Design an enzyme around this catalytic site. Structure first.
Site, PDB file in Angstrom:
ATOM      1  N   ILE A   1       0.819  -1.212   0.000  1.00 14.92           N
ATOM      2  CA  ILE A   1       0.000   0.000   0.000  1.00 14.92           C
ATOM      3  C   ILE A   1       0.846   1.252   0.000  1.00 14.92           C
ATOM      4  O   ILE A   1       0.626   2.121  -0.826  1.00 14.92           O
ATOM      5  CB  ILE A   1      -1.035   0.005   1.132  1.00 14.92           C
ATOM      6  CG1 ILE A   1      -2.003  -1.158   0.926  1.00 14.92           C
ATOM      7  CG2 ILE A   1      -1.790   1.332   1.160  1.00 14.92           C
ATOM      8  CD1 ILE A   1      -2.653  -1.172  -0.485  1.00 14.92           C
TER       9      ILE A   1
ATOM     10  N   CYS B   1      -9.769  -2.373   1.758  1.00 15.77           N
ATOM     11  CA  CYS B   1     -10.004  -2.556   0.330  1.00 15.77           C
ATOM     12  C   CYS B   1     -11.403  -3.098   0.050  1.00 15.77           C
ATOM     13  O   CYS B   1     -12.117  -2.532  -0.765  1.00 15.77           O
ATOM     14  CB  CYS B   1      -8.932  -3.431  -0.299  1.00 15.77           C
ATOM     15  SG  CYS B   1      -8.716  -4.974   0.519  1.00 15.77           S
TER      16      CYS B   1
ATOM     17  N   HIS C   1     -11.038 -13.204  -3.417  1.00 15.29           N
ATOM     18  CA  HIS C   1     -10.083 -12.166  -3.062  1.00 15.29           C
ATOM     19  C   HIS C   1      -8.681 -12.675  -3.366  1.00 15.29           C
ATOM     20  O   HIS C   1      -8.357 -13.828  -3.013  1.00 15.29           O
ATOM     21  CB  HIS C   1     -10.238 -11.883  -1.552  1.00 15.29           C
ATOM     22  CG  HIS C   1      -9.455 -10.711  -1.047  1.00 15.29           C
ATOM     23  ND1 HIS C   1      -8.078 -10.644  -1.108  1.00 15.29           N
ATOM     24  CD2 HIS C   1      -9.854  -9.579  -0.422  1.00 15.29           C
ATOM     25  CE1 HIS C   1      -7.669  -9.511  -0.565  1.00 15.29           C
ATOM     26  NE2 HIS C   1      -8.726  -8.843  -0.147  1.00 15.29           N
TER      27      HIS C   1
HETATM   28  C1  LIG Z   1      -7.707  -4.731   1.766  1.00 13.24           C
HETATM   29  O1  LIG Z   1      -7.428  -3.508   2.473  1.00 13.24           O
HETATM   30  C2  LIG Z   1      -6.860  -5.843   2.384  1.00 13.24           C
HETATM   31  O2  LIG Z   1      -6.443  -6.758   1.380  1.00 13.24           O
HETATM   32  C3  LIG Z   1      -7.676  -6.620   3.397  1.00 13.24           C
HETATM   33  O3  LIG Z   1      -8.809  -7.208   2.754  1.00 13.24           O
HETATM   34  P1  LIG Z   1     -10.244  -7.200   3.499  1.00 13.24           P
HETATM   35  O4  LIG Z   1     -11.007  -8.372   2.906  1.00 13.24           O
HETATM   36  O5  LIG Z   1     -10.795  -5.865   3.049  1.00 13.24           O
HETATM   37  O6  LIG Z   1      -9.892  -7.288   4.993  1.00 13.24           O
END
Ligand SMILES: *C(=O)[C@H](O)COP(=O)(O)O
Ligand SMILES: *C(=O)[C@H](O)COP(=O)(O)O
Ligand SMILES: *C(=O)[C@H](O)COP(=O)(O)O
Ligand SMILES: *C(=O)[C@H](O)COP(=O)(O)O
Ligand SMILES: [Cl-]
Ligand SMILES: [Cl-]
Ligand SMILES: [Cl-]
Lengths: 334, 334, 334, 334
Positions: free
Chosen positions: D13, D151, D178
């Site tokens: 980031i 995110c 993800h």
């Molecule tokens: C995104 O800020 C980071 O990859 C963490 O993912 P989340 O599913 O938003 O916790």
């Protein structure tokens, strides 16, 4: 009756050595030392992404865990010398932490009360470096600390020894196209040893890098010391690797068939031979330390001058583990 | 005004050549022939997994599509000789199907009415094989069918030419650690040419295999014909490759710095030089045909006898495409 | 004494069904039909990237190959009706080409002389669609063409049946996070059915897509016809998938423990149950058609209104295969 | 008179925020704090596996590095409160270490001399949680510590807000398919927070897991607090993710077209809209916080009762970064 083994560091090699020791009689794992908790350790023993579900039964009990009705004690002790090896009657420690890869540091296990220590990595200081079925014969029994070399070294030794013995090795270079290891990063990040390439995303790149085999080979085969060198290309497979070796030889009219035939003749439990057009996943889980691949033998001839290329597959996890356990059994009976 | 290009086969190379020709003035793509439908083609031009979103605008119109306000005619014709090349005034066909890789077969474009044909692969028969900035000088202008060699050949030629010219090449072997291509299988399945290794799951294996570069190199550098040979290891990255070359040289006291300096001095638009510890994804989309990587240079010396190893990166997609478009431009202006 | 099976299409399912039929008595594979050659077929049976080396022995003989001393005839015939099924005494054809997924088309095997045909995919026309241990009871024996549903349908049926039977299913949506299959492309390329998403690099993308289970579920459980729908996300693992189902129920105070307990109680050979925090590679090679994962059960309650989410793992290769062979056995004994 | 930014933690980031800040005028990165050395930092800025080569120029100079002629100071200080923020005149610290995700801990930057702190993660304690273009309006200017959410939260907020505002949200569940992050392991190994699933090989498994978005959503949209919940499936792609949301609504005859049209109308710089059959790699490097995907809209209707499913893409790296920099700019100007 049975040899008492304690594993220090329940990482990939430690857990896999544990699995393998299940198939070998005369070897019991009685202790496991790692800084993580038992629930995590039992879970990682039970389930393995590349090597499959553990075939027996694993449950966390009081002093550690029970594997197929057998008790394994577990400790969480970062200083090896403290460990209850004396109290437990350890015959050999399989040292797989990475943090004791030195004859003098590994001595702590002997103080703590263990008879011998086998280091599952190249190790520094005054000790023997052993590739089973290549030079284990050099163990007399008095040794208390022994290095079991590296995965790549184990893939290389049997191939170089044939090449040298039958054709005379002048010089050679080597590249291992090598699966990524847990010491590499998941995403681009700072790396522990400042390595700008291990720093990179392991499963998204061909990553040039070094190999243990390079320097640790002349220790296994003294007559070819300084004559080989080379590196690695870490690539996106989780286990399964391949050593390519390009050499110059003394013998003059070397043919592809000559080379293959020489390797075929030297094959055993440690050193396999194949003519099948296989690929890396085909060796995941194999117990040869090195599998010569006759389909990859090439000979370049320009006048009297030749370059000879060969290649040998190895599961940088299980092949090395199998070799390590063999060295362990042998060491325990001297 | 501008040179009229028709692309045959809108595959990886075809579409990427299309993108690249956008940045080059004096070249227009006016025709595209492929057997798939237009919606699919415009979609695959717009979106690219490794090479990124197409920067302009793409929409399906009547006779084909409109790219940045420009009209591109599209056809669905499996027999090249039928194509309206005559009617359209094609100066050069970029031939990327795989199915016309022969001087005599590629002649069909000339019948259909095009002036010249550049084949984006090694091709058989009486024709020149060209790596831009290595031997494009051998084009006199009369040729009507030309091979643009292969991606690996383009990664190799500038390296071998420096090696030969400055040190004298006795002999060499090579391995390309090479990204998987669309001719490999997603899952273990029968393969189109009976290749038991390309048959295997592309993104889950180190897959030994053959290379175009091996044989097609003496065609680019005649003075080293028959002196190199080697193969590939297909590995799980989608684009980005690396050619390793191990050689024996005439010159006697070669150092690492000697070799690197030789390569740096020969660098140009086609042939890059770097000392940065990069990895494969670092060259995705690069326009050098070859990038010499001075961090990988190794020299093995045992007495008077040396083995020299060098390595050059290339985007087997974009690097080769950029070279191909260069050859295209040059060919069009003779 | 044993049931005679002929496999049409030696793809992933065909070869795996062959492997699985080895562990099942009373079933013999006597014929195999595929358009590729026998060397290729023997090789792909012997070696499997995800499912491991074939445990027996495979060698190419005259009329086909010999597996563990047993002879398997092989043909290369693209029109099923020609096949020597009559001459060979085939009891059942395992139809795995993809090209005969219709009652009327699959009829060609019965003409060629086979008794029954089990299609390893959802199929159109007047036939039963079977998920073993969910609705195989609906086979009376007279059927000559049967669909074995799909891999996902097999992961879903036992779960939906419990949900409907115990709690009353109002409506539900579903996503399968699903391993990529050989119908997807290695690199971004035109796709055979104009699918812009299946067109994309399989191992480099989350790829939204459709599922067989969506529509083919009301065929397995008629009482919930039109009450479920959903899709897939194809992701970069080569085998191993997971079905997530989000539903609205009649029963009013549903708890997580209630749901889990209902699933646990319905478990059998086809439908497993686990509370271990597993991952996809943990189910590679498993023979359950569906493994309920109680760790993923979630219940959202806002006043009297609930949304229930459950998840079940499946090896879309071996899980489906084990199910298919079960149906095959049962069908053969009527 | 440009805003002075200091980045704490030069991870994915941080580095990407640096890159983005290059394209935004009125924002300068003047300081960078991380515990690794500068050579490593310059290297990782220059080269990015998924996001490509850094377009400007980066060289290591004395007090840090020079980016496109501009000086960036660098520190190696594990205790934030020590940092020379006062001396340097920092306006805002972009806090990306992971180790200060709490209002009280992050206060150390204010002590050290910075005006404001934006935490690139959900944070605990008395602070506002902001998704730009969803609720940034709630910043009045007095705040000194702000969370920039996560995110996924950013991918979810604009979609939930439309659904709630237009149709009335009763309840919903969600799954984000993800990309794997650096906090997951390369190979099966012990995990830092005891997470048995994050422990597993990231690039070889579908790995169920939790999401920040789940709980942190009612903080961004208070009117739907406690009405959504859900999790993640970590899968083998290195960046690019997709949020699927399954909801129950108040409005009665919802159609697919209604939902899409509602989303289309609410689109802006933060919230994109698309009808193209895209895949994950098509969003790598995009600057929308969230991209609604109208091709994935589904509506299940059984009598008067509906379940609505939508999905939105986001580059969990760049999309989140772009959102974070917008929040940063806005915070700076109050
Ligand atoms: C995104 O800020 C980071 O990859 C963490 O993912 P989340 O599913 O938003 O916790
Ligand atoms: C094998 O012991 C280890 O993973 C890799 O190092 P090498 O030096 O390639 O053996
Ligand atoms: C590029 O030409 C294509 O990948 C074929 O590879 P080669 O290594 O050139 O044969
Ligand atoms: C399994 O039969 C195959 O991959 C098809 O998957 P579905 O999602 O079941 O259609
Ligand atoms: Cl190719
Ligand atoms: Cl399919
Ligand atoms: Cl994270």
């Amino acid at each position: 009756m049975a040899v008492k083994v304690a594993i220090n560091g329940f990482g990939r090699i430690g857990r896999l050595a544990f699995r393998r020791i299940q198939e070998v009689e005369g070897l019991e794992v009685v202790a496991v030392n790692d800084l993580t908790d038992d629930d995590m350790l039992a879970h990682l023993l039970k389930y393995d992404t590349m090597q499959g579900r553990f075939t027996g039964e694993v449950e966390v009990v009081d002093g550690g865990f029970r594997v197929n009705g057998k008790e394994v004690k577990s400790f969480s002790e970062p200083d090896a010398s403290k460990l209850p090896w004396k109290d437990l009657n350890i015959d050999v420690v399989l040292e797989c932490t990475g943090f004791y890869t030195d004859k003098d540091k590994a001595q702590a296990h002997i103080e703590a009360g263990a008879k011998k220590v086998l280091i599952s990595a190249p190790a520094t200081g005054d000790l023997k470096t052993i590739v089973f079925n290549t030079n284990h014969q050099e163990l007399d029994g008095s040794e208390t600390v022994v290095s079991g070399a590296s995965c790549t070294t184990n893939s290389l030794a049997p191939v170089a020894k044939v090449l040298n013995d039958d054709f005379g090795l002048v010089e050679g270079l080597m590249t291992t196209i090598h699966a990524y290891t847990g010491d590499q990063n998941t995403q681009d990040a700072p790396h522990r040893k400042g390595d700008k390439r291990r720093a990179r995303a392991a499963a998204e790149n061909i990553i040039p890098n070094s190999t243990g085999a390079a320097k640790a080979i002349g220790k296994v085969i003294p007559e070819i010391d300084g004559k080989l060198d080379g590196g690695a290309q870490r690539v996106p497979v989780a286990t399964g690797s391949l050593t390519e070796l390009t050499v110059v030889l003394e013998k003059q009219d070397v043919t592809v068939e000559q080379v293959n035939e020489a390797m075929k003749n030297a094959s055993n439990e440690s050193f396999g031979y194949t003519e099948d057009e296989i690929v890396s996943s085909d060796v995941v889980g194999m117990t040869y330390g090195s599998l010569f691949d006759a389909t990859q033998t090439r000979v370049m001839s320009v006048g009297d001058r030749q370059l000879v290329k060969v290649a040998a597959w190895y599961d940088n996890e299980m092949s090395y583990t199998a070799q390590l356990v063999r060295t362990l059994a042998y060491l325990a009976e001297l």
